[PDB]
Amino acid sequence: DMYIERAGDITWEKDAEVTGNSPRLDVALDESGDFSLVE
């Protein structure tokens, strides 16, 4: 049996840590909800 526990409020926090890039990716979405890269 799965259970839930509260972890936090949902807020924008000023001066978070800033990272990650912004790729433009060609993708396909199958009937099982699996994304894949098209090339």
């Binding site: 799965m2 839930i4 972890a7 936090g8 409020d9 924008w12 978070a16 433009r24 099982s32 994304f35």
Partner: protein, 156 residues
Amino acid sequence: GETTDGVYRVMTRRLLGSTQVGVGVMQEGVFHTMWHVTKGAALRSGEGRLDPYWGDVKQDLVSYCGPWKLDAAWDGLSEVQLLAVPPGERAKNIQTLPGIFKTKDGDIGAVALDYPAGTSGSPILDKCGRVIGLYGNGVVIKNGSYVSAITQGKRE
């Protein structure tokens, strides 16, 4: 059960100790997570029970106790925050400029951040604190890095 708005861990004791299988969002009395986290099973909150209400294996989403409530969208321009809730670690905001998933059915925002699988369902927010979608469905790229869609449901 606890029906306070905010971000929750999803746990199981079906394995060794207590294992975090994913995350979700309580809003307007409805619990929102990714389908792959629960596989549509019922959830406990205290001695409260949450029954699935709506799900879609292809969207990889599910709601508990009522219909999908989350209707904000990425603007396609502005940074967003992944409010990451990793296993055994505090909630942590990570600010990023989404890329794009290009599909035959249209363009979807996507975040290039790499967190444990048990982070599945952590919310992505805009500058006003609105949930624009849920992290933890996407793709491994040429680099062996992970990129997740910004997965959002439809509000009726």
